[PDB]
């Protein structure tokens, strides 16, 4: 499985010294599920790479628990390599364009499933096989608030 760090869907937290990330309880005192994540360098802009186990929990990870429970699965989770989602771009001084980022690691063969906020459009639909949508949304602009003077 390939996953990306997006605020409300997939959280990423450093693990405790013992290896297991510390437990916590929600507003109703119910155990929130967490899974152990390998993957990123823990240093995106200031080092080449070196992997380290971490902890994940969120929307997509919660659905994967319910999804795999019915399917009788055996799953491992590893994050993306270089953050970016994916696009088609001609590599430096070559013949044809090849896929980028998260989509690349699945088409190459490094993973068999993407559980992440991936959109639906024509360009990606050529080479990948999607599923029925599990959330609807759009595009909006975020701006800074205006002071209500006095």
């Amino acid at each position: 499985i390939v996953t990306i760090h997006q605020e409300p869907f997939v959280y990423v937290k450093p693990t405790l010294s013992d290896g297991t990330c510390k437990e916590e309880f929600t507003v109703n005192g119910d155990p929130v599920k967490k899974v152990i994540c390998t993957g990123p360098n823990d240093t995106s802009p200031g080092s080449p790479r070196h992997t380290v186990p971490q902890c994940c929990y969120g929307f997509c990870i919660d659905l994967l628990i319910k999804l795999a429970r019915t399917m009788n699965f055996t799953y491992e989770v590893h994050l993306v390599a270089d953050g970016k989602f994916g696009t088609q771009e001609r590599v430096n001084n070559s013949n044809k364009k090849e896929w980028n980022g998260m989509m690349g690691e699945l088409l190459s063969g490094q993973a068999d499933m993407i559980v992440a906020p991936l959109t639906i459009n024509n360009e990606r639909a050529q080479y990948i096989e999607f599923s029925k949508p599990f959330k609807y949304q759009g595009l909006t602009i975020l701006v800074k608030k205006e002071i209500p003077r006095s």
Partner: protein
Amino acid sequence: VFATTGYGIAMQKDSHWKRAIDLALLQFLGDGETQKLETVWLSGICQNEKNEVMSSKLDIDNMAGVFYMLLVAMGLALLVFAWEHLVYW
């Protein structure tokens, strides 16, 4: 909306027509050509309109809160009567 799903085109199970028109439909939405078609048949006069006739004050919702604060203040005079008289005699 509850239990959100969508409309579709029902076709025979395991057919060879699926992939062809699946990409065609994704082409339509991903270009805005469905927006022009959507604004011709799904349009209403008061879509962007909302104006309540009134919320007539002939109802005890906020003036009632004022009314009972007056009763609270009204009891202060009775308490002051005992305190003022007893402390002065």
